Amino acid sequence: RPVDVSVSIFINKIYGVNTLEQTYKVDGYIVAQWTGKPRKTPGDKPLIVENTQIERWINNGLWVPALEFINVVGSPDTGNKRLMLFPDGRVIYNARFLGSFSNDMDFRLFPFDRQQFVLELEPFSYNNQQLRFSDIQVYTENIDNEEIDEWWIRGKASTHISDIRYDHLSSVQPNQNEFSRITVRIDAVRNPSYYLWSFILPLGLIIAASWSVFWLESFSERLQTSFTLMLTVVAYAFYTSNILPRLPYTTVIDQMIIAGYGSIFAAILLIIFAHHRQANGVEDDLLIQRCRLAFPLGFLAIGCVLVIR
Amino acid sequence: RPVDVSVSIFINKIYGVNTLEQTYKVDGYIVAQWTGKPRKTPGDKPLIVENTQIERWINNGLWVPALEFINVVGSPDTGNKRLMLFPDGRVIYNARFLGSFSNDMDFRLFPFDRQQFVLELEPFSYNNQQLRFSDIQVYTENIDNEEIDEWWIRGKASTHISDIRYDHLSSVQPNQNEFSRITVRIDAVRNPSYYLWSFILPLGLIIAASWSVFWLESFSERLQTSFTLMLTVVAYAFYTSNILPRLPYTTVIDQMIIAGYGSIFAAILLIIFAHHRQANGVEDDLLIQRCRLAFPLGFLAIGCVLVIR
Amino acid sequence: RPVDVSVSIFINKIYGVNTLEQTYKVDGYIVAQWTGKPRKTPGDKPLIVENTQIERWINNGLWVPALEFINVVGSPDTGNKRLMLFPDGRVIYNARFLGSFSNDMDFRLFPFDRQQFVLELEPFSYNNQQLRFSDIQVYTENIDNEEIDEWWIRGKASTHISDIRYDHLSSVQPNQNEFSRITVRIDAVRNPSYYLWSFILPLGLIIAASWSVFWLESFSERLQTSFTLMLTVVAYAFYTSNILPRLPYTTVIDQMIIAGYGSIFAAILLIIFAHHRQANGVEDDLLIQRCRLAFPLGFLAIGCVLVIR
Amino acid sequence: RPVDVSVSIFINKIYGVNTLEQTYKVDGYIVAQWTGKPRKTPGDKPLIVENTQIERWINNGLWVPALEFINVVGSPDTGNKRLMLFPDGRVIYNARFLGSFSNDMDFRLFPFDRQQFVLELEPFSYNNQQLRFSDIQVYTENIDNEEIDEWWIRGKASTHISDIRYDHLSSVQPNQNEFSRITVRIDAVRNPSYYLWSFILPLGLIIAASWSVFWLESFSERLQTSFTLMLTVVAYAFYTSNILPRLPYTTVIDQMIIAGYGSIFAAILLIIFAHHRQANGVEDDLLIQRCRLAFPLGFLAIGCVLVIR
Amino acid sequence: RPVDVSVSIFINKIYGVNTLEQTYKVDGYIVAQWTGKPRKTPGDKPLIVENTQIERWINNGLWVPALEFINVVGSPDTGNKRLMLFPDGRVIYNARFLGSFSNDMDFRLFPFDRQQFVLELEPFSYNNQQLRFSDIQVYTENIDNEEIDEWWIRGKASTHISDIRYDHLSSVQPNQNEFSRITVRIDAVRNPSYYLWSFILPLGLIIAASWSVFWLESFSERLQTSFTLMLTVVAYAFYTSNILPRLPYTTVIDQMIIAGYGSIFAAILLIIFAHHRQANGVEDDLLIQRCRLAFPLGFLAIGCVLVIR
Ligand SMILES: FC(F)O[C@H](Cl)C(F)(F)F
Ligand SMILES: FC(F)O[C@H](Cl)C(F)(F)F
C-alpha cells in the first residue's frame, strides 16, 4: 500500500555556524522520486514543469507530498522547484534549498572540538503506511583546498532511514503513529590553525613572561610589576572574548585565562610573603629564587592535569 | 453554542533571549482540533490537505479560525500547514512556527536570575460565545545535557485557560466581549557557572589584589600604584560590558565593579590621609597597616550586606 | 458627504529606539469603523472575514480604504487582519501591526532625555471631502513594574485630529487638497539609573582621583603620573563610547570625558610650569599644594556652568 | 508619438549612510502622470484604485509602465500603491517607497566631507520613442533643526532629464536604444560636531602632552615615559576605529593618529641619542630643553603640509 | 534540434565581500534570447510583457526556461522582469538581479590579495540536448575614481561556455546527462591604502621601538619596561583583530604580531640572561649593546622569511 519514495540530497556548502544558537547553514539540492498512476504527456517524452507551474498541477489534483526538514530553524529558502512527470507513472521533485539547521553542539573543547552537521527529513502529513523512504543517497563535493576552509570535512556522509513513534497524537490509534525519517550525518573537525598561533601561543608567552617577576630583585619592583602583569591579562581576556565565539560555558582558552589570573594573584601573595616570612624582617630569598622554578613548574604541573574532557 | 477547540503545542527549542527587548525565540508545532459539519471524503478515510491548498478550501467555505499568538513580536515564521479533514466532522489544523515572544523579564539578579518563558494564544476574531478553548496540552523535551545548555528548565510546562474581558470594544454589548485565552508558562533558572568562573572570580582576584597597595612602603609607591589599579578596573568594566548582556539597570557584577572603583578611591583617600595626619611629618604607619585588614574586612563586611533583593 | 471613520489604536510595546536613525518600534492593533450600504448577512448576526478572505471581498467591490502610517519607515509587518461586516451597514477593520516609526528625537540631554513617540495616521487616497476621521482613542497598557523597563511612559497618550494642506497636487481643485490626520503622542523619559551608577559615578571618581596628582612630592613623580591618568581617560572614553548610543552630537557623558582630558592637560601644564616658574629651577611648591584644592573647586566651578540646554 | 510622463518625487527621510558600500537610504513617494485612451468611470468623477487592485486592471490591458530606480540596490520596499484614473484619459500612479540607493561617495575629508544623494529614474522597458519624461519635480522638507541631525542638507534638490544610449542592445537598429532618465541630486554636508569635540580635540591634547616628555630631567624618566605615551596612541587608535566609519582609505583623524605615532617615535629616537651624542657619556642637555620648543614647532610645521585634497 | 539561448550579463556593482562565508554581492541585469514559433503580435511590432504579466503567458503555455545561478547563496532578489516577444519567433528575457555569490576565496596574503568574482550560470531543468548557450557577453562599468573604492577591478571579465557531466542521474541513459554552463570571471585586487598607513606602519614603529629596550642602562629598567612593551602588543593585537576581517587562518599581519610577541619574549630572556651569565654578578654589558642591533636585524630577518606563498 505505501508509496516508496527515493531521496537524494546534494550538499553544496556548509557554513555560518552559530555557536550560541547551535545552528549551521546548508545549501544544497533535494531530489525525491516516487511512482503513481501513469499519465498522458505531450509526446512520449517526459514533461517538465517548473516553479509556479507546479502549483497548477497540484490544483488539478497532482499528488506532491510535503517533505519537512525536522531540524531546520525557520522556513528554508527555496530556490528553483521542478517536477518531472514520466508517462509510466513516476514523478521526480527537484528543488534547491538554503536553510539553517539545528543540532546539539558541544563547543567545550574549543578550538579542538569535533562537530557533526545533521539533516533530518520526514514527511509532514503522511505516516509510513502511506509514504515510506525506500533509500537515501547523499553526495558531497571533494574539497581539495580544504586548508582554506573554516571546517574540514572528515569522511563521507552517513545515512539512516528509520521510523519515529509519536505517542502524543490527536489522530487515531492502530499503527498510525509512525513516520519514515531520513537522517543525514556529516562529521567535521574545526580548523585549529588560527587559534593555536594567534591565541594559544601568545597567551602562553604572556603567562610565562609573568613568571619572570621573581627575577626582579626588589620587593617594590616585584609587587608593582605584577599589577602591570594583572592589567595585561585583563587586556588579554578582552582580546580573546571579543574575537572568539560566545558560549554559555568556559572553553580551554577561557580556562587558561582564568589560570593566568590565578598565577599572578598567587605570585602577588608569595612576593608579599617572602617579605615577611622570616624573623629579622629579612627577605627569605630562599623562597623567591626557588620561585624562579617553583612557578614555572608548579603551575605547569598542577596545570598539566587539565585532562577535563 | 460555542465550538470547543483543543490545542496541543509541541515546543522544540527556546533560544535566543534578547535582554534589552525582553523577548525570546520559540520553535515548535501548534495543533488545533474542533468538530464541524460531517463530510464526504474520498474513501471513508480522512483527507489530508497541505500548504497552499488550505486556502482553496477556505474559499469554498471551510472554517479555519485565525488563532493569534497574543504576545508574539512580528508575524511568526510559519512552515508547513496541514489540515486533516475527518468524515465524522472533525478538523485538525497542524502548523509549524518560529517566533519571537515577549514577556516581562527581570534580569536584575544576573547571573543568578530566574525567568519564565510564556506563550499566550487567543482567537483573533471570535469570542467565547463562538469559540472556546476546551483544553491545552504542552509537550517539551526533557533536557539532561543541561550542562552545555545555558538554561535549566524547572519542570514540565504549566498552563491556564481563562476568559478575557475587553473594556473598549466597538462591537456590541451582551456577553460578547470576552475571549478565550490559553497561557503556557515554562520556568527556568540560569546556569551561573560561566559567569562565576570567568567574570565573578577574576573580578574578585583583581579587587583583592587591589588591597595589596598597603604593603607598599613609601607613600609614593602607594599613591602612584593605585592609579594603575584604577586603570585595571576600567579595563575590566570594558571587558565585562562588551560581552555581558545589555540592560537598563545594574546587575550584581555591575555593582562589584562599582565597588572596585570605590575601594580604590577610598584607598587613595586613605593613602593620602595617613601621609599628612600627624605632626613631625612622620608617616602615620598606624593608620596604614590596620588598613591591611580594614579593607579586606570592611569591603568584605560592608559587602556581605548587599541584601537588596 | 464625507465618510466618517472612527479609529482606535492599542499600543502593546514600544521598544528598539534607534538614535542615529531617530526611529522606534511599535507593536499594536488598529481598529477602524465606518458605515456603508446595509447588507444581508448569514443570519442577522455580523459576518467575520479574516485575512486572505478580506482580499476576495475587495475584488468583488467592497470599499476598504487603505490607511497609511505617515511616519512609518518601511512597509510595516501586518499580522492577522479582520473585517467584521454588520447587517446595518457598518464595517470594522482590525489589524495587528509592528512597524518602525520616525520622529524628531533630541538626545542631547542623555541620559536624562525626554522623547515622545508619535504615530501619525492618514488616508492614502481620500481627502476630507471624501473621508475624514471623526474621533481618536488610544489605549496603552499600564506597566506597573516600569523599573525593569528602559523607558518610563509618562502620562496617557494625547491625541489630535487635524487637517493637512498639500500645496503641490496634480489632482483637482475645489476643496480637494486637504486630508484628515490622526496624531498620537506618547511622552517618555529615560531610565537614568545604569548610566548614573555605572558611567557617571566612576567617571567622577576617576576625574577626582586625578586631582591627587598634586599630592605627589617629586616633580618627576607628578609629571610621569599624569600620563597614566591620561591613559585612564582614553580607556574610559572607549568604554563609554562602545556601550552608549551613537549620536552626531555630544552628551553630558561625552562632555565630562572631555573635561577629564582637560583637567589632566591643565595639570600637566602647571606641574611643568611650577618646575620652572621661579628662579633656581626650584620646584615652585607655592603653586602646587594650593592646586590641591584649587582644581577640586575650579573644575567644580567652571564645570558647574554646563547649563548648555 | 512617445508618451509624455510627468514625475514628482517627494522625499521624506534620507538616512543610514553605509560608507563602505557607498549607499544611503531614502524614504519617499513617487508620482507619475500620463495620458491614455479616455475611459468610462463611475460618475463623471475620477476613479481611485489602491494596492492589490492595480494588478487586476493590468490584466484587462491597462498600460502601467515600469519605472525603475537605476541606482537602487535590491528591490525597494514599496508601501501603498495607487492609480488615479480620470475619465478624460489621464492616469496617475502614486507610490510610497523605501530603498537603498547607490552613488559615488568620497569620505577622504571626513568628518568634514560633503556628499550628494542621488536618485536615478528610467523606464525599464520603453525607450524615448515610446516613453519620455516631460518633467521632474522634487520636493523636500524645510529642516530647521539640523543641529540634531547627522547630515545638513545644503540647498534644494536639482533635477535632470536626459537620454541614455545603450549601445549593446539585442534589439533592432533605428533609435530604439535610447532611454529617457530623470536624475535627482541632493547635496549634503556632515555635522562635524561630535567628531570635533570628542575625537579631534582630545587627540591633539594627547599629542600636545606627548611633547612634554622633554621636560623630564633624567634620561631614564624620558625613555620609560615614552612607552606609556606610545600605548596611549594605540589606545586612541582603537577608540576611534571602533566608532568611526570604516573606509578603505585614511582620513584626517586617521592621519592625526599616524602623525601622533611619529611624534612619539621621533621623540624616542632623539631621547635615545641625546644620551649618547657626545663623548663623556653626557646627556646632551644642549639638545634636549632646546627640544622643548623645537618639536612642538617641528611637528606642527611638518604637520602643516597635510594638504592632501 | 536543441534550442540556442544567447545570454548577455550587465554588471552594476560588486560589493559586500564576506570573508568567513567566502561570498560577495552582485547587482546586475541578465538578458537571454532564443527563437521559437512565430507569433501574432498586436501590430507587426514586438510585444512587451512586464512583471506580473509574464506568469499569465506561462499558464497559456509560453515556454520560458529557468536559468539558475549555480553558485548563488540563497534565492536572489529579482527586481523588474521583462519579456519582449518578437513576431518572427525570437524571445527576449530581461531581468534585474541582486544576489550573494560563492567562490573559493584565499585571504592569506591580506591586505594584498587578489580575488575572482565568479558567476556560474546554467539551466535548471533542460540538458544540452534540449537547451544550449550559444554565446555570452559580459559588460562592466568603467571606474575612473578607483582610489575611493574598496576593490580595484583588474581587467575585463573573462568568459567560457562549457559542458558538465553529472554522474548520479535517475533518468535514462543515452546522451541525456550533460548541461550547458556559462562561467563569468572578474579579477580584482584590494586597495591596501588604509591598511598600510594606519595598520602596517604603526606596527613597524611599535615593533621597532620595542628594540629600544636594550638602550636602558639598568637591569630593573630593562626588565620592568619589557612588561609595558608586552601590554602594548596585546592592545595592538586587539586594535587589529577588531577591525581586520575575521578569518580561520593567519595573515601576514597576524604573523608580524606573533613575531612581535616573539621579539619581546626573546628580549625578556636575553635581558634576564645577560644579568646572570657571568660570575660575581658583573652585568654582561657586551650581550646587551650587541643587542641594540642584534634584534633589529634578527627579527627583521626571521620576519623577512615569511615568504610562505
Ligand atoms: F599604567 C600605565 F600608566 O603605565 C604602564 Cl601601562 C604600567 F601599566 F606598566 F604601569
Ligand atoms: F592597554 C590595553 F591593553 O588595555 C587598555 Cl587599552 C588600557 F590601556 F586601559 F589598559
PDB file of N, CA, C and O and ligand atoms in Angstrom, chain A residues 224-225 227-229 231-232, chain B residues 224-225 227-229 231-232, chain C residues 224-232, chain D residues 224 227-229 231-232, chain E residues 224-225 227-229 231-232, ligand 1:
ATOM      1  N   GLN A 224      54.910  45.834  42.423  1.00  0.00           N
ATOM      2  CA  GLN A 224      54.403  46.797  41.464  1.00  0.00           C
ATOM      3  C   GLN A 224      54.369  46.230  40.065  1.00  0.00           C
ATOM      4  O   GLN A 224      53.464  46.529  39.308  1.00  0.00           O
ATOM      5  N   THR A 225      55.319  45.387  39.716  1.00  0.00           N
ATOM      6  CA  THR A 225      55.302  44.878  38.372  1.00  0.00           C
ATOM      7  C   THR A 225      54.119  43.980  38.163  1.00  0.00           C
ATOM      8  O   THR A 225      53.482  44.032  37.125  1.00  0.00           O
ATOM      9  N   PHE A 227      51.197  44.228  39.141  1.00  0.00           N
ATOM     10  CA  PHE A 227      49.969  44.960  38.844  1.00  0.00           C
ATOM     11  C   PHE A 227      49.919  45.260  37.362  1.00  0.00           C
ATOM     12  O   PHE A 227      48.860  45.431  36.805  1.00  0.00           O
ATOM     13  N   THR A 228      51.068  45.357  36.722  1.00  0.00           N
ATOM     14  CA  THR A 228      51.092  45.557  35.294  1.00  0.00           C
ATOM     15  C   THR A 228      50.793  44.228  34.644  1.00  0.00           C
ATOM     16  O   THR A 228      50.126  44.152  33.625  1.00  0.00           O
ATOM     17  N   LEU A 229      51.271  43.166  35.255  1.00  0.00           N
ATOM     18  CA  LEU A 229      51.030  41.837  34.731  1.00  0.00           C
ATOM     19  C   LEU A 229      49.541  41.505  34.807  1.00  0.00           C
ATOM     20  O   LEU A 229      49.022  40.815  33.949  1.00  0.00           O
ATOM     21  N   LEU A 231      47.097  43.740  34.684  1.00  0.00           N
ATOM     22  CA  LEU A 231      46.490  44.529  33.635  1.00  0.00           C
ATOM     23  C   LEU A 231      46.653  43.849  32.309  1.00  0.00           C
ATOM     24  O   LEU A 231      45.786  43.928  31.480  1.00  0.00           O
ATOM     25  N   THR A 232      47.767  43.184  32.096  1.00  0.00           N
ATOM     26  CA  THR A 232      47.981  42.558  30.818  1.00  0.00           C
ATOM     27  C   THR A 232      47.029  41.412  30.615  1.00  0.00           C
ATOM     28  O   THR A 232      46.546  41.187  29.522  1.00  0.00           O
TER      29      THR A 232
ATOM     30  N   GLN B 224      51.029  56.226  43.550  1.00  0.00           N
ATOM     31  CA  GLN B 224      51.192  56.014  42.124  1.00  0.00           C
ATOM     32  C   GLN B 224      50.632  54.682  41.678  1.00  0.00           C
ATOM     33  O   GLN B 224      50.112  54.555  40.576  1.00  0.00           O
ATOM     34  N   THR B 225      50.750  53.689  42.546  1.00  0.00           N
ATOM     35  CA  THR B 225      50.326  52.340  42.219  1.00  0.00           C
ATOM     36  C   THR B 225      48.826  52.234  42.126  1.00  0.00           C
ATOM     37  O   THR B 225      48.320  51.502  41.295  1.00  0.00           O
ATOM     38  N   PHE B 227      46.801  54.245  40.926  1.00  0.00           N
ATOM     39  CA  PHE B 227      46.312  54.753  39.659  1.00  0.00           C
ATOM     40  C   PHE B 227      46.313  53.642  38.637  1.00  0.00           C
ATOM     41  O   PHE B 227      45.451  53.602  37.777  1.00  0.00           O
ATOM     42  N   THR B 228      47.225  52.694  38.781  1.00  0.00           N
ATOM     43  CA  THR B 228      47.266  51.549  37.891  1.00  0.00           C
ATOM     44  C   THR B 228      46.124  50.613  38.239  1.00  0.00           C
ATOM     45  O   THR B 228      45.527  49.962  37.381  1.00  0.00           O
ATOM     46  N   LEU B 229      45.803  50.559  39.517  1.00  0.00           N
ATOM     47  CA  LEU B 229      44.728  49.709  39.955  1.00  0.00           C
ATOM     48  C   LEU B 229      43.426  50.233  39.371  1.00  0.00           C
ATOM     49  O   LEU B 229      42.646  49.474  38.817  1.00  0.00           O
ATOM     50  N   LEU B 231      43.132  51.983  36.627  1.00  0.00           N
ATOM     51  CA  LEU B 231      43.140  51.655  35.213  1.00  0.00           C
ATOM     52  C   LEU B 231      42.681  50.220  34.989  1.00  0.00           C
ATOM     53  O   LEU B 231      42.085  49.894  33.981  1.00  0.00           O
ATOM     54  N   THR B 232      43.019  49.347  35.921  1.00  0.00           N
ATOM     55  CA  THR B 232      42.706  47.935  35.803  1.00  0.00           C
ATOM     56  C   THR B 232      41.207  47.663  35.917  1.00  0.00           C
ATOM     57  O   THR B 232      40.675  46.781  35.256  1.00  0.00           O
TER      58      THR B 232
ATOM     59  N   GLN C 224      55.156  62.191  35.421  1.00  0.00           N
ATOM     60  CA  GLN C 224      55.081  60.834  34.886  1.00  0.00           C
ATOM     61  C   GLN C 224      53.718  60.226  35.154  1.00  0.00           C
ATOM     62  O   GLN C 224      53.206  59.447  34.354  1.00  0.00           O
ATOM     63  N   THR C 225      53.140  60.580  36.292  1.00  0.00           N
ATOM     64  CA  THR C 225      51.848  60.050  36.687  1.00  0.00           C
ATOM     65  C   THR C 225      50.728  60.584  35.818  1.00  0.00           C
ATOM     66  O   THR C 225      49.766  59.877  35.540  1.00  0.00           O
ATOM     67  N   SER C 226      50.858  61.818  35.349  1.00  0.00           N
ATOM     68  CA  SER C 226      49.792  62.402  34.549  1.00  0.00           C
ATOM     69  C   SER C 226      49.568  61.607  33.288  1.00  0.00           C
ATOM     70  O   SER C 226      48.459  61.535  32.786  1.00  0.00           O
ATOM     71  N   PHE C 227      50.602  60.940  32.816  1.00  0.00           N
ATOM     72  CA  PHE C 227      50.471  60.175  31.601  1.00  0.00           C
ATOM     73  C   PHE C 227      49.686  58.916  31.821  1.00  0.00           C
ATOM     74  O   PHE C 227      49.051  58.417  30.910  1.00  0.00           O
ATOM     75  N   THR C 228      49.702  58.411  33.043  1.00  0.00           N
ATOM     76  CA  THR C 228      48.913  57.238  33.334  1.00  0.00           C
ATOM     77  C   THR C 228      47.473  57.660  33.407  1.00  0.00           C
ATOM     78  O   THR C 228      46.598  57.009  32.862  1.00  0.00           O
ATOM     79  N   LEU C 229      47.235  58.816  33.991  1.00  0.00           N
ATOM     80  CA  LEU C 229      45.883  59.286  34.115  1.00  0.00           C
ATOM     81  C   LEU C 229      45.293  59.577  32.744  1.00  0.00           C
ATOM     82  O   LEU C 229      44.133  59.271  32.482  1.00  0.00           O
ATOM     83  N   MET C 230      46.107  60.141  31.865  1.00  0.00           N
ATOM     84  CA  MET C 230      45.676  60.442  30.511  1.00  0.00           C
ATOM     85  C   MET C 230      45.193  59.154  29.864  1.00  0.00           C
ATOM     86  O   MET C 230      44.149  59.132  29.225  1.00  0.00           O
ATOM     87  N   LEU C 231      45.954  58.082  30.027  1.00  0.00           N
ATOM     88  CA  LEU C 231      45.552  56.786  29.505  1.00  0.00           C
ATOM     89  C   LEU C 231      44.265  56.287  30.121  1.00  0.00           C
ATOM     90  O   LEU C 231      43.496  55.612  29.475  1.00  0.00           O
ATOM     91  N   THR C 232      44.035  56.596  31.384  1.00  0.00           N
ATOM     92  CA  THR C 232      42.852  56.073  32.036  1.00  0.00           C
ATOM     93  C   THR C 232      41.626  56.692  31.394  1.00  0.00           C
ATOM     94  O   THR C 232      40.626  56.020  31.180  1.00  0.00           O
TER      95      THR C 232
ATOM     96  N   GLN D 224      61.443  55.825  29.567  1.00  0.00           N
ATOM     97  CA  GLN D 224      60.381  54.977  30.067  1.00  0.00           C
ATOM     98  C   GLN D 224      59.021  55.618  29.876  1.00  0.00           C
ATOM     99  O   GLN D 224      58.069  54.942  29.538  1.00  0.00           O
ATOM    100  N   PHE D 227      57.075  55.023  26.501  1.00  0.00           N
ATOM    101  CA  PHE D 227      56.308  53.796  26.263  1.00  0.00           C
ATOM    102  C   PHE D 227      54.859  53.893  26.696  1.00  0.00           C
ATOM    103  O   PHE D 227      54.001  53.231  26.141  1.00  0.00           O
ATOM    104  N   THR D 228      54.594  54.748  27.669  1.00  0.00           N
ATOM    105  CA  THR D 228      53.252  54.984  28.125  1.00  0.00           C
ATOM    106  C   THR D 228      52.534  55.818  27.093  1.00  0.00           C
ATOM    107  O   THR D 228      51.374  55.594  26.783  1.00  0.00           O
ATOM    108  N   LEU D 229      53.247  56.765  26.511  1.00  0.00           N
ATOM    109  CA  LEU D 229      52.652  57.613  25.513  1.00  0.00           C
ATOM    110  C   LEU D 229      52.310  56.796  24.294  1.00  0.00           C
ATOM    111  O   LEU D 229      51.221  56.902  23.762  1.00  0.00           O
ATOM    112  N   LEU D 231      51.591  53.668  24.141  1.00  0.00           N
ATOM    113  CA  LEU D 231      50.423  52.883  24.463  1.00  0.00           C
ATOM    114  C   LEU D 231      49.172  53.721  24.340  1.00  0.00           C
ATOM    115  O   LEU D 231      48.166  53.242  23.845  1.00  0.00           O
ATOM    116  N   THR D 232      49.237  54.982  24.743  1.00  0.00           N
ATOM    117  CA  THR D 232      48.059  55.833  24.696  1.00  0.00           C
ATOM    118  C   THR D 232      47.626  56.087  23.251  1.00  0.00           C
ATOM    119  O   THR D 232      46.447  56.225  22.960  1.00  0.00           O
TER     120      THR D 232
ATOM    121  N   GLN E 224      61.502  45.632  33.867  1.00  0.00           N
ATOM    122  CA  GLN E 224      60.193  46.180  34.186  1.00  0.00           C
ATOM    123  C   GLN E 224      59.586  46.846  32.956  1.00  0.00           C
ATOM    124  O   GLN E 224      58.378  46.862  32.778  1.00  0.00           O
ATOM    125  N   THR E 225      60.422  47.415  32.115  1.00  0.00           N
ATOM    126  CA  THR E 225      59.915  48.071  30.944  1.00  0.00           C
ATOM    127  C   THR E 225      59.371  47.077  29.932  1.00  0.00           C
ATOM    128  O   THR E 225      58.354  47.331  29.309  1.00  0.00           O
ATOM    129  N   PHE E 227      57.686  44.569  30.262  1.00  0.00           N
ATOM    130  CA  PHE E 227      56.325  44.202  30.589  1.00  0.00           C
ATOM    131  C   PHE E 227      55.341  45.223  30.048  1.00  0.00           C
ATOM    132  O   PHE E 227      54.196  44.906  29.787  1.00  0.00           O
ATOM    133  N   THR E 228      55.799  46.456  29.890  1.00  0.00           N
ATOM    134  CA  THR E 228      54.994  47.516  29.309  1.00  0.00           C
ATOM    135  C   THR E 228      54.936  47.335  27.804  1.00  0.00           C
ATOM    136  O   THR E 228      53.943  47.624  27.168  1.00  0.00           O
ATOM    137  N   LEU E 229      56.016  46.857  27.219  1.00  0.00           N
ATOM    138  CA  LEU E 229      56.004  46.592  25.797  1.00  0.00           C
ATOM    139  C   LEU E 229      55.052  45.474  25.493  1.00  0.00           C
ATOM    140  O   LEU E 229      54.385  45.513  24.474  1.00  0.00           O
ATOM    141  N   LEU E 231      52.300  44.671  27.168  1.00  0.00           N
ATOM    142  CA  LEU E 231      50.956  45.197  27.237  1.00  0.00           C
ATOM    143  C   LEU E 231      50.624  45.910  25.961  1.00  0.00           C
ATOM    144  O   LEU E 231      49.526  45.810  25.461  1.00  0.00           O
ATOM    145  N   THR E 232      51.597  46.591  25.391  1.00  0.00           N
ATOM    146  CA  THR E 232      51.348  47.341  24.183  1.00  0.00           C
ATOM    147  C   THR E 232      51.042  46.428  23.017  1.00  0.00           C
ATOM    148  O   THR E 232      50.174  46.732  22.225  1.00  0.00           O
TER     149      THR E 232
HETATM  150  F1  LIG F   1      49.935  52.006  33.917  1.00  0.00           F
HETATM  151  C1  LIG F   1      50.500  52.761  32.968  1.00  0.00           C
HETATM  152  F2  LIG F   1      50.261  54.040  33.234  1.00  0.00           F
HETATM  153  O1  LIG F   1      51.890  52.574  32.973  1.00  0.00           O
HETATM  154  C2  LIG F   1      52.244  51.337  32.454  1.00  0.00           C
HETATM  155 CL1  LIG F   1      50.972  50.919  31.372  1.00  0.00          CL
HETATM  156  C3  LIG F   1      52.159  50.314  33.542  1.00  0.00           C
HETATM  157  F3  LIG F   1      50.969  49.731  33.410  1.00  0.00           F
HETATM  158  F4  LIG F   1      53.136  49.414  33.410  1.00  0.00           F
HETATM  159  F5  LIG F   1      52.206  50.917  34.732  1.00  0.00           F
END
